[PDB]
Ligand binder design. Structure first.
Ligand SMILES: Cc1cc(-c2nc3ccccc3o2)cc(C)c1O
Ligand SMILES: Cc1cc(-c2nc3ccccc3o2)cc(C)c1O
Lengths: 114, 114, 115, 115
């Protein structure tokens, strides 16, 4: 039900081998680790969770943009890119979180479908 | 070698049934019709051209954003979104032109891969 | 009534010295030159037109992004970024056309105000 | 030395009355409140800090986008837009953090200048 897609606006390419960490907000308002991985050669990270586990709640997707840019020898602005949202059962069932990265900027969108 | 992907930033969805026209710049500097279609239920338009036909040159991809927004009952700013680029044989072989649409704004990127 | 602002997403800076050409669609459906200029050290281009001259019409703002990137040593994807819109069709408005540039991407927005 | 600018991509306008909270990472690795305010009728938030107070550190600018959209009748995707960055680590700089908002998307950039 959750996929993350990361693109590079400098090179016009997928952003490959980017670390992504997903957290779920706990009852005490802290962020508990939920899922993680590294983007593939297509800039995608699949397999993070299952329908059973991905219950309604507040989630944070953290994309390690700084390390990505540093590996390319480029000085970036942000420590990371953060996407924070509520999963809602009454909306469509599949969430794609997409991010388009530049050294001093990023764009993010959600594509939520059935 | 050419795919167009259109997303809706208001609804968080693919932008479905959007008209897309591709033109190739002619020797006399006019834009000659090249390919066209309507985005699918996934916001994608595949099958526009072939490797044989998609020779090096300057291309324009015109996305009919105004009609899209009007069909949703939303007043938009732009007449259309235009993406103009050179196809180059020495770069990667497959071009995805992606657009992320809002009523008064849009984002576009190119994902060029082998 | 028409201002253009250009930012560089690689440098985190205004995009300075960017050429901008504005056209207006004529009665015969061709794109007539309307005005032109270059962005300043703030990434802004002011003074393109006047409220008298900026009548209703369909306008195209062409931002010459390719030349900008090439001069930074980047061979960019796009030839230019074009922004096409109807202006002043409910009376005079002020338009800011903003663009944020990367070598293989850009975003553009408009801020439209009624004086 | 720190300004926040917020634009609305649906309306083509400044995003007015947007709450913004700035935090700074403390020695113990927690996010300490640093400053806060709301965007003006221009979509800008000035006066958050001073060059004396805005020392080197890791800062988080939280833009309360959800509340903004809900008040326009749109149930948006994100809880907020957060911008996290190291500041002033090569001496004082001026930072503009800009955000362009849609219900299911945003973009953000920084403009960093050396006075
Ligand atoms: C211009 C743009 C494209 C995308 C985009 N998301 C995509 C997903 C699959 C294939 C191509 C894609 O392009 C995402 C964002 C946040 C953007 O600002
Ligand atoms: C297209 C765009 C414009 C801006 C923008 N930032 C601006 C600052 C002052 C005036 C107009 C401005 O437009 C910011 C972002 C994150 C964008 O994606």
């Amino acid at each position: 039900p959750l996929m993350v897609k990361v693109l590079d606006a400098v090179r016009g390419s997928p952003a490959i081998n980017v670390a992504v960490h997903v957290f779920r907000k706990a009852a005490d308002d802290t962020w508990e680790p939920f899922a993680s991985g590294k983007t593939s050669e297509s800039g995608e990270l699949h397999g993070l969770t299952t329908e059973e586990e991905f219950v309604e709640g507040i989630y944070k997707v953290e994309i390690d943009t700084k390390s990505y840019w540093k590996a390319l020898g480029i000085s970036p602005f942000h420590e990371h890119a953060e996407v924070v949202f509520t999963a809602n059962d009454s909306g469509p069932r599949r969430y794609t979180i997409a991010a388009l990265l530049s050294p001093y900027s990023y764009s993010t969108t959600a594509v939520v479908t059935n």
